[PDB]
Symmetry: D2
């Protein structure tokens, strides 16, 4: 029951394509919608166009969209990005805190965190879903 | 609205059992409630039905109820489908305007998870076939 | 039926555009045809709409047509839904009895891919949003 | 590619069972073949596991085989996964490059259906949980 709405989020690390290290708590104070995906996962990639459109649509608002590849190694991820260009800042993560503190066994996975850095939904709806817009608006 | 956020109170609505008797969502206050809103022509809905039944089996004796609620426009195709496909769980049907107007049920499949307190856990809950619904349900008990 | 296997001839049906003019599937013979059968209150159908529109745009000028066919019981919600949601591809609607009785379309969403000769490629085709549909379509072109 | 169109010959690949015995897809020529290519961390993949198993039961004794093929990069999580979740069909694992290369399979879940001549029916078959897969299989078993 650590992951239920209202419970605090759990930090993890992520690398960007250049090498900078960011941690989830850097975005403390914004609404955070996280997309976990991987290059060989069809249903994950099917959601990318909608996650990107959300990014564009809320550019002017206090929410951060984190796309985090969980590919085992970095190279299929970078190889994938070279062929499939993206507008949001891309992250990559094989942080053990994802598996052991977030208990993430499967992807796709979507998470919505509110401004106080509390979980709103540990199991958030997909970015292509009709309701995510209102869910997101509600949270702002 | 902000009224469907986690921690907000569930909204009651009326449904009908296969015998044409009224029931209310409120009758279940005190249990964890997982609702499956579905319809006979909806492939994905009908795809989850095996998993929703198996959840009912798997959690027999825990304080949760599984409500399969048809949103078919008329009861006729619902009862026809049920004659040709038997189910362990008690089946319900609803056309209550409150589904569209208080729960913003514009589309199906729609899954909803409500807590023993009759508060929303997730108004857009994961699907019955997912690993995630198990873990989430385990967490609310 | 064995009538829907790849390489078997497609089955014609009637549909209406927004202005009530009639067309038939067979009018498009000679092109690759990708059909999206959907309805206004089908969540997963409408979630594919952006991708289906993106394919139509991506393949403009190539020898393929994209047919968005609403199977809504009546015309009205279809038309209202379109007023709110402007789509680029020409929209159709159909209650032709053949959909159910020849194509065995019992459930939506449903996607169908037909080749230039008007034979079935895949009567249960991948979804518009999938990576798999583009490679499929290119295969066929 | 054009080589994965219905009616084209299927493409062999090597796979291993939980004991390390080797089998090749082409060994099954003569039977309809429905392949489920999945991995332990792909949620949508294992969402289909029950239905795939239900189908192997529904069609026991008929001229079709059901092949669940883990594409996990390593065998350990696969083996660990089956440990804790029991399964009636014989389980297989593959990392044959023929998958990516010749079958041009870049994403899972992925399902393939092959006819008794070892020709492709659908390289992109419906999911096991779907209502149509059973109509499709039956349609292939009659022909
Ligand atoms: Cl949640």
């Amino acid at each position: 029951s650590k992951l239920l709405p209202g419970q605090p989020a759990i930090d993890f690390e992520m690398l960007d394509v250049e090498g900078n290290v960011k941690h989830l708590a850097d975005f403390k104070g914004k609404v955070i919608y996280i997309d976990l995906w991987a290059t060989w996962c069809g249903p994950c990639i099917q959601e990318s166009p909608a996650f990107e459109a959300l990014g564009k649509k809320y550019v002017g608002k206090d929410i951060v969209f984190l796309p985090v590849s969980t590919d085992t190694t970095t190279k299929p991820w970078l190889r994938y990005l070279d062929g499939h260009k993206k507008e949001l800042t891309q992250y990559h993560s094989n942080d053990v805190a994802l598996k052991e503190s977030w208990a993430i066994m499967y992807i796709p996975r979507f998470i919505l965190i509110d401004k106080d850095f509390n979980i709103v939904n540990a199991y958030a709806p997909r970015p292509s879903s009709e309701e995510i817009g209102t869910l997101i608006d509600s949270v702002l």
